[PDB]
RNA sequence: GUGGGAGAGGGUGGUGGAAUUCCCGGAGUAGCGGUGAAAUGCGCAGAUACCGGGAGGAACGCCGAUGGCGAAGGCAGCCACCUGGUCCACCCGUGACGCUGAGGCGCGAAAGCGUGGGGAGCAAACCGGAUUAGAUACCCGGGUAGUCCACGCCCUAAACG
RNA sequence: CCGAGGGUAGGGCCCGUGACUGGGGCGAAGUCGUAACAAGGUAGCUGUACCGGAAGGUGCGGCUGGA
RNA sequence: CGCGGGGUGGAGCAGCCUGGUAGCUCGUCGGGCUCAUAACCCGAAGGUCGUCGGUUCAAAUCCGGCCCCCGCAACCA
RNA sequence: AAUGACCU
RNA sequence: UGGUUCGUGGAGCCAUGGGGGAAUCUGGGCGGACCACCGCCUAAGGCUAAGUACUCCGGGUGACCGAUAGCGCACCAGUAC
RNA sequence: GAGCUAGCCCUGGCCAGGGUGAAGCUGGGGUGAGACCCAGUGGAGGCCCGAACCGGUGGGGGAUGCAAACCCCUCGGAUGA
RNA sequence: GAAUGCCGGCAUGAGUAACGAUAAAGAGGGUGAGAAUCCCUCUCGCCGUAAGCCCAAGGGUUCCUACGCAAUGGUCGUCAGCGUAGGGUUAGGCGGGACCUAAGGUGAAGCCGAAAGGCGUAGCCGAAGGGCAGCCGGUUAAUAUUCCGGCCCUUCCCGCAGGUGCGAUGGGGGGACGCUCUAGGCUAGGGGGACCGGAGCCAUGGACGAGCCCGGCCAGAAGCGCAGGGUGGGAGGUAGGCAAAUCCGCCUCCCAACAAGCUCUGCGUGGUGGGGAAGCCCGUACGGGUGACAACCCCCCGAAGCCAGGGAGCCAAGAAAAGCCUCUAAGCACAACCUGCGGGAACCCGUACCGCAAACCGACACAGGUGGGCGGGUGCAAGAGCACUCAGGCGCGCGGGAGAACCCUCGCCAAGGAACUCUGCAAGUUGGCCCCGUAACUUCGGGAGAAGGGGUGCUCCCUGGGGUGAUGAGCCCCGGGGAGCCGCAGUGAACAGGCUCUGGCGACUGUUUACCAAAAACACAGCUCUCUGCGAACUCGUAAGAGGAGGUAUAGGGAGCGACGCUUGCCCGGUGCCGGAAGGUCAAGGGGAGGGGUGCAAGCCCCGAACCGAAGCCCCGGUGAACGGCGGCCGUAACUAUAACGGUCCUAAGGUAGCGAAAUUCCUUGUCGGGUAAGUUCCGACCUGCACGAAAAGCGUAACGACCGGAGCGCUGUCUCGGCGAGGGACCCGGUGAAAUUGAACUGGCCGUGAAGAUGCGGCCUACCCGUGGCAGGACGAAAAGACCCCGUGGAGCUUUACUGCAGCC
RNA sequence: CGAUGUCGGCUCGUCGCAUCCUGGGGCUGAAGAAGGUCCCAAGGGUUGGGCUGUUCGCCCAUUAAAGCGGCACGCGAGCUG
């Protein structure tokens, strides 16, 4: 839906906030299962190695369930859907009859009170997790494992999915959010449905501060700098570059493919 | 204005203390040099309890 | 009111096959496209033609009409749901409740604008190859918005009987 | 007290004028092309869009005021 | 003032550097097609190569001096 | 595969 | 690749990161590519005094200084600052 | 050497008092149902005025200064990057 | 004898500048060898969201007292933060440690690295965070939440007494959390009182009076009372909480639905304890006595603090661990554990004093910098604003005169009112509140405090709402109406916008050259390009490893553009990057035709052509929100002028829309038009654009701007053109007393001359000796081994299709 | 070049005359008036605004006139910037 504001201030005239109506009466989270201390820090042991990180709201990590094959066969009741500061998506709090409480990343269409479960069994319904094999060709799916028993790694961003395209002996072909065509092992779990919160892309930050709230420090142009700092630094009053556009570290930034050629992963990929 | 000396007993101790110098080869040599020199004070005297 | 009737009427979901294009494998050569004629173009880096597999989008051949439905715009593969108008029969109920309609309100082809999605074919603009005295055109090879979808705008028409 | 009027400030409508600019009407024999009327030599007209010295061209849909 | 590129029929351009032959397009003129004009077709004419000097057997061409044409430079003060 | 000065 | 006077030179010898990979006296290396001849040695385990180097320390001496010199310090100096 | 300065991490603190009045909620109105319109309430905002507080705009003073960056007047921000 | 030489000493300027805020002094009396400066008293001035008070940091003896003044104090000094000595810092309850965890550090296991060393789950370390039991008074010259008094707690250990399955570093619960706005009731704090207590005072015209003045409080266990916070109770089933569990979790039935009940805080009250002014008298540097058997009461205002884990809303979604509660495992159930009560036990370190400053950081008794808490009263709309002022603390460690120039800071002005000037620079006008009243434009918010106006004090009368209160008096908040008084003037002092018109740039709040640039630069949302399928790309590191990210294409990295609106054309020839299982070239390696050196020979050792050989380049294509580029010459219309049209050369393509003498225009003050009396600027146009132009974006844009330009109104000392006055210096007297500079000096003008600008040489002219206040023309004045320029085969930063390597990648 | 601060403005002036005005004079194609032109003469005077950093210049309104030039394109230990 997206919340919109009137221009009672500049920067309030474009600003735009998510709709939280799917956030069920459960705004503060769940101890026990999560949260952990989350360790803010824009850099490695010592030095900054990703520029322009820092500031922005304190967070608690929700330790979510990315391998659903523990509770094969054990169903769970979806108890709530809550805000997760550390991902684009929303998260489902679910209660297993087992007693155990996990969070699942919350797919589009998930309703509270719903039944959900994981395993070879598993009715093909939104929320359920299955090894890729038993899932019908052509159904859209998410939180897909890359290699079996290694955890969900594909399609967890808000409003993303992959579609099952066909099969090939032990592998089923996937079409990933990027549009790539991937052979992913049959035995990999993946949960049916799309991610949801799909209006995430429609949000307009609206002002500088908002950027900072999310811990995004000001990014400065190479043009703004000096020859010591950047290939684009200097010279006089503005300058068009004077070389093929580059990163600060000298590599070209328009076109230069960067995936290494001889990756053994290659023989499992069929697209862009 | 604000000058450059902003005394702190803990800082002076953690930074220039006998135990800090002892911790690394760089520092151990400092004690060696100061000893051979005949320095009355190997490290700065940080006070208080 | 009761009982029925025909319909591409409308909205949503799902699904079928033919064909074009692209990809992969096979087999296979010296040309293929195209025109009034050509050339640009594609092709010995393995093309066109043929076969097997895959992907995808759009439009629904025959039925089809000089036909049907709708208030107009307009509506056509099939399936199910939701849903408007309408025709007949019976003469059962109400009992003049009627007609029109300034303004209002709603709908409204195509092109066009906004946001996101999609993009096979086609194709403004654009680039070529011709044709001509010259061609910013007609012809030919390419090709982008657009054409498709969702939501929101635009309010026009030889919106014509 | 109200009060003609004078004053200051700011609006509303109307008229005149203005370098320059837009298209228009009109003026016997100047220029460029051939758009339309005969299938006018690419059926025409049309709403919209884009393009072109100019008529105009083309895309999309529509009309018979064409076969 | 300096630099380096340029003047060729009526128009626009070749031809120079590897000296001896000046060619392309348009235009002009004569004829044809047409009722006529244009388009088109057939024939034909047309060039002191800016000047002045000479190097050579021979200069559009190579070399010097001027004259116009264009382009660049004219900085630190 | 264009064009046909003006009035009558 | 380093080491040797040896900087790729005709470039050996000695050490060695990589690859291949023997032999036990009729076995192996060396005498400056290499081959023949004549010779010299016996690798791939180790230890080993003395002659040698230095002067925190003690002693001796000086065609060495004599408090702006001589060690930064003759004096409570690596102190005061 | 990050006890000055720059950035980030952990944990605390601070921001007088005034204005303007977004959403929403509630009532009334409108419609077939709506959209919407009125009040009333409500208290949003890198919103306004202005101390603390963070700055350093213009001018003057100061120039062996009170000060190796200061002083007076004036000024920007002041719930937020 | 020179090296702007080196160390030292002493000169010159010089009794010169200065004596560190313009908050301010005067007198009397002491002490003393010596008083502007020390002590005391009276008067005056200054601070009072402090210039008062209490903490933290830092400092470390500066605290107190006795004795002293050489030096330190910008003067003096009997004084001191100084010298000599002595004294002073008392805790189970305050803070820190025999408690906990954060970032981070360290680090057993483990991984890595020539060495040194680098990582690293557990654990440990690590605090203005969590946990934890003291409140009110009295005492010392100097310490007190520490000693003492009163009242009240907490831990252990040994006992008895009574309960229960007790029992872990282990399971769970809890601890436990944002921001903004907030309700109810309290407390802190404060105002008033005819009421209670109190020495006292009638002044100078009046007042012996609900007269003036002072004070009417603080703590307090149980028990109550009032506020509020936490929380459901059962019974079964159980596969999760990594062994077990009765605990928790999930499921199902009952009962509550409520704070009803348990609790737990806060606040009142509480046995009782303590305190308790003005003034008066005293002798202290200061405190003492009395006032007192002090009184200790009623109203009102009232927090930002408490009840706290209260409530509502919002998005950016808001530490951890121990204590504590509970569960059970090994064990043990003569142990142990809980509760009551007695006795005993309760260590280590800090405690002085300064602390917005003369004791900390600035070399200084430095006009600067320094975190937290309290910060009273009155008025001004409010307030931590401003004026005055309680408490409390200061008059800033040179004074005394004078009354010049000049400077600083300040006040006023005739008439004119920007004529000043680069520019209204500066200064002025404007200024609070209430009520009227407001334009273009606009993104519908704004613009708006638009602009422009009027009201504002005091008195008396009538009158409307609330709060606290019984529905009442008062006491306290907001109002309305009518009369009338005074002055030049009513936010009568202080605090408190000048305004409008039109351009340029950037959307905007923001950021930056600490110490000459705050901007049109940077950032910014937002737009596009491109890389990245996850052990991601990328970055850091030799590595291990870490960031990215406990993220996964709606995500992450890189690049350019920079809200928004309308748009962003043509060229792929060159450069880049992307795509091409062909071909050409291509190193090591493979292959050996063939040849060479030696050997009597087997042999041994060298070269070596075919041919097979990667990436890269060549070659074929693609791609411009990739690097980038986007023409010239002739002629033509029935007046001229001009050129829609034509010819020709060239290119990879020949700049489209929109703008255009521009932050871009050389010629240039282009040419018209507008503002002006006059306008190299400004605004609007024309286009001949030297040399705009579409993401180094193009043309616009409401709002915003300590940005930059032009204009007008208001108002003025900016000016005509100055004048006067004020205070701080300047000057004179007393006290202390520098500095840069300095070849030496007995240091005049002119016309000459000279290395071409002479006090110093020549001629002439003038001129007694020495100071004081002033002015700056000269001493090519001081200050810095010229910044510019060149020189040196000097040095650094930067660039690239310079050379040559290297990392990285292939 | 071990430093001679460099434009313009302001302030303060001062000098040369090849005089802008005012005084004297000759010729004039000087009727008069007002001009032209030359010679003598610097004693005094030589305005206020608009634009520009401007010097200069062009304007507006005047005037008897709106002089030219030197003094390190006079003058920053005097200011401005
Ligand atoms: N005429 C009315 C409107 O204006 C235009 O018409 C104007 C022009 O286009 C037109 O020009 C014509 C030209 O087309 C034609 N081929 C040649 C002719 N000599 C010209 O003629 C014009 O010019 C001449 C002199 O200058 C005058 O004397 C004469 O009156 C005038 N019509 O003349 C008209 C002026 O009178 C539109 N073409 C026309 O269709 C439109 O409706
Ligand atoms: Mg590191
Ligand atoms: Mg470290
Ligand atoms: Mg940036
Ligand atoms: Mg820069
Ligand atoms: Mg660079
Ligand atoms: Mg430039
Ligand atoms: Mg550059
Ligand atoms: Mg139907
Ligand atoms: Mg094939
Ligand atoms: Mg009937
Ligand atoms: Mg009708
Ligand atoms: Mg429509
Ligand atoms: Mg359409
Ligand atoms: Mg569209
Ligand atoms: Mg978008
Ligand atoms: Mg096509
Ligand atoms: Mg033709
Ligand atoms: Mg075509
Ligand atoms: Mg469009
Ligand atoms: Mg008009
Ligand atoms: Mg025609
Ligand atoms: Mg036609
Ligand atoms: Mg036609
Ligand atoms: Mg059309
Ligand atoms: Mg076209
Ligand atoms: Mg002819
Ligand atoms: Mg220079
Ligand atoms: Mg014609
Ligand atoms: Mg005719
Ligand atoms: Mg006629
Ligand atoms: Mg060597
Ligand atoms: Mg060697
Ligand atoms: Mg060599
Ligand atoms: Mg080896
Ligand atoms: Mg050997
Ligand atoms: Mg050997
Ligand atoms: Mg040998
Ligand atoms: Mg030999
Ligand atoms: Mg030997
Ligand atoms: Mg041996
Ligand atoms: Mg030995
Ligand atoms: Mg001697
Ligand atoms: Mg000595
Ligand atoms: Mg001596
Ligand atoms: Mg010495
Ligand atoms: Mg820091
Ligand atoms: Mg406020
Ligand atoms: Mg507010
Ligand atoms: Mg509202
Ligand atoms: Mg604000
Ligand atoms: Mg503000
Ligand atoms: Mg403010
Ligand atoms: Mg405060
Ligand atoms: Mg700053
Ligand atoms: Mg100054
Ligand atoms: Mg301020
Ligand atoms: Mg000498
Ligand atoms: Mg000396
Ligand atoms: Mg004196
Ligand atoms: Mg003097
Ligand atoms: Mg003096
Ligand atoms: Mg003095
Ligand atoms: Mg003083
Ligand atoms: Mg006062
Ligand atoms: Mg002492
Ligand atoms: Mg003392
Ligand atoms: Mg004493
Ligand atoms: Mg003294
Ligand atoms: Mg002093
Ligand atoms: Mg004495
Ligand atoms: Mg003392
Ligand atoms: Mg102990
Ligand atoms: Mg500890
Ligand atoms: Mg840790
Ligand atoms: Mg750790
Ligand atoms: Mg370590
Ligand atoms: Mg610990
Ligand atoms: Mg604590
Ligand atoms: Mg404690
Ligand atoms: Mg004390
Ligand atoms: Mg006690
Ligand atoms: Mg138990
Ligand atoms: Mg626990
Ligand atoms: Mg009396
Ligand atoms: Mg009282
Ligand atoms: Mg009490
Ligand atoms: Mg268990
Ligand atoms: Mg008393
Ligand atoms: Mg709460
Ligand atoms: Mg622990
Ligand atoms: Mg103490
Ligand atoms: Mg104390
Ligand atoms: Mg003090
Ligand atoms: Mg303080
Ligand atoms: Mg002092
Ligand atoms: Mg101070
Ligand atoms: Mg000090
Ligand atoms: Mg402070
Ligand atoms: Mg106050
Ligand atoms: Mg008050
Ligand atoms: Mg106020
Ligand atoms: Mg104040
Ligand atoms: Mg005046
Ligand atoms: Mg006056
Ligand atoms: Mg005036
Ligand atoms: Mg002026
Ligand atoms: Mg002037
Ligand atoms: Mg101005
Ligand atoms: Mg001003
Ligand atoms: Mg305005
Ligand atoms: Mg800005
Ligand atoms: Mg600066
Ligand atoms: Mg600024
Ligand atoms: Mg500044
Ligand atoms: Mg944009
Ligand atoms: Mg990692
Ligand atoms: Mg991570
Ligand atoms: Mg990105
Ligand atoms: Mg930019
Ligand atoms: Mg472009
Ligand atoms: Mg290319
Ligand atoms: Mg190109
Ligand atoms: Mg190409
Ligand atoms: Mg390639
Ligand atoms: Mg080879
Ligand atoms: Mg070989
Ligand atoms: Mg032989
Ligand atoms: Mg190759
Ligand atoms: Mg122009
Ligand atoms: Mg003009
Ligand atoms: Mg003016
Ligand atoms: Mg004018
Ligand atoms: Mg203009
Ligand atoms: Mg230009
Ligand atoms: Mg530009
Ligand atoms: Mg561009
Ligand atoms: Mg821009
Ligand atoms: Mg603007
Ligand atoms: Mg700003
Ligand atoms: Mg600004
Ligand atoms: Mg004045
Ligand atoms: Mg005066
Ligand atoms: Mg005075
Ligand atoms: Mg003399
Ligand atoms: Mg001379
Ligand atoms: Mg002389
Ligand atoms: Mg002499
Ligand atoms: Mg004198
Ligand atoms: Mg002088
Ligand atoms: Mg002076
Ligand atoms: Mg001088
Ligand atoms: Mg000098
Ligand atoms: Mg020099
Ligand atoms: Mg130099
Ligand atoms: Mg050289
Ligand atoms: Mg010089
Ligand atoms: Mg000198
Ligand atoms: Mg004369
Ligand atoms: Mg005369
Ligand atoms: Mg004169
Ligand atoms: Mg001016
Ligand atoms: Mg000049
Ligand atoms: Mg002069
Ligand atoms: Mg000159
Ligand atoms: Mg000068
Ligand atoms: Mg300047």
Swiss-Prot record, chain A:
Keyword check for Thylakoid: no
Region feature (Disordered): 222-272
Cellular component, GO annotation: large ribosomal subunit
InterPro entries: NA-bd_OB-fold, Rib_uL2_dom2, Ribosomal_uL2, Ribosomal_uL2_bac/org-type, Ribosomal_uL2_C, Ribosomal_uL2_CS, Ribosomal_uL2_dom3, Ribosomal_uL2_RNA-bd_dom
Basic residues bias locations: 256-272
Sorted UniProt keywords: Ribonucleoprotein, Ribosomal protein, RNA-binding, rRNA-binding
UniProt xrefs under SMART domains: Ribosomal_L2, Ribosomal_L2_C
Entry annotated with the keyword Heme: no
Single annotated GO MF: rRNA binding
Biological process according to GO: cytoplasmic translation
Bias type Basic and acidic residues, positions: 229-239
Subunit structure: Part of the 50S ribosomal subunit. Forms a bridge to the 30S subunit in the 70S ribosome, contacting the 16S rRNA. May also make transient contacts with protein S6 during translation in the 70S ribosome.
NCBIfam families: rplB_bact
Function comment: One of the primary rRNA binding proteins. Required for association of the 30S and 50S subunits to form the 70S ribosome, for tRNA binding and peptide bond formation. It has been suggested to have peptidyltransferase activity; this is somewhat controversial. Makes several contacts with the 16S rRNA (forming bridge B7b) in the 70S ribosome.
Similarity comment: Belongs to the universal ribosomal protein uL2 family.
Protein name: Large ribosomal subunit protein uL2
Species per Swiss-Prot/TrEMBL record: Thermus thermophilus (strain ATCC 27634 / DSM 579 / HB8)
Curated annotation (Swiss-Prot), chain B:
Cellular component, GO, one term: ribosome
Keyword Glycoprotein: no
Annotated InterPro entries: Ribosomal_bL34, Ribosomal_bL34_CS
Biased composition, class Basic residues, residue ranges: 29-49
Keyword ATP-binding in annotation: no
Region (Disordered): 26-49
Keywords annotated in UniProt: Ribonucleoprotein, Ribosomal protein
Gene Ontology MF terms: structural constituent of ribosome
More details: The open reading frame (ORF) for this protein is entirely within the ORF for the RNase P protein (RnaP). The two start codons are separated by four nucleotides.
Function: Found on the solvent side of the large subunit.
Family named by the database record: Belongs to the bacterial ribosomal protein bL34 family.
Oligomer and partners: Part of the 50S ribosomal subunit.
PANTHER family given in the database record: LARGE RIBOSOMAL SUBUNIT PROTEIN BL34M (PTHR14503:SF4), MITOCHONDRIAL RIBOSOMAL PROTEIN 34 FAMILY MEMBER (PTHR14503)
Protein name, as recorded: Large ribosomal subunit protein bL34
Organism (species): Thermus thermophilus (strain ATCC 27634 / DSM 579 / HB8)
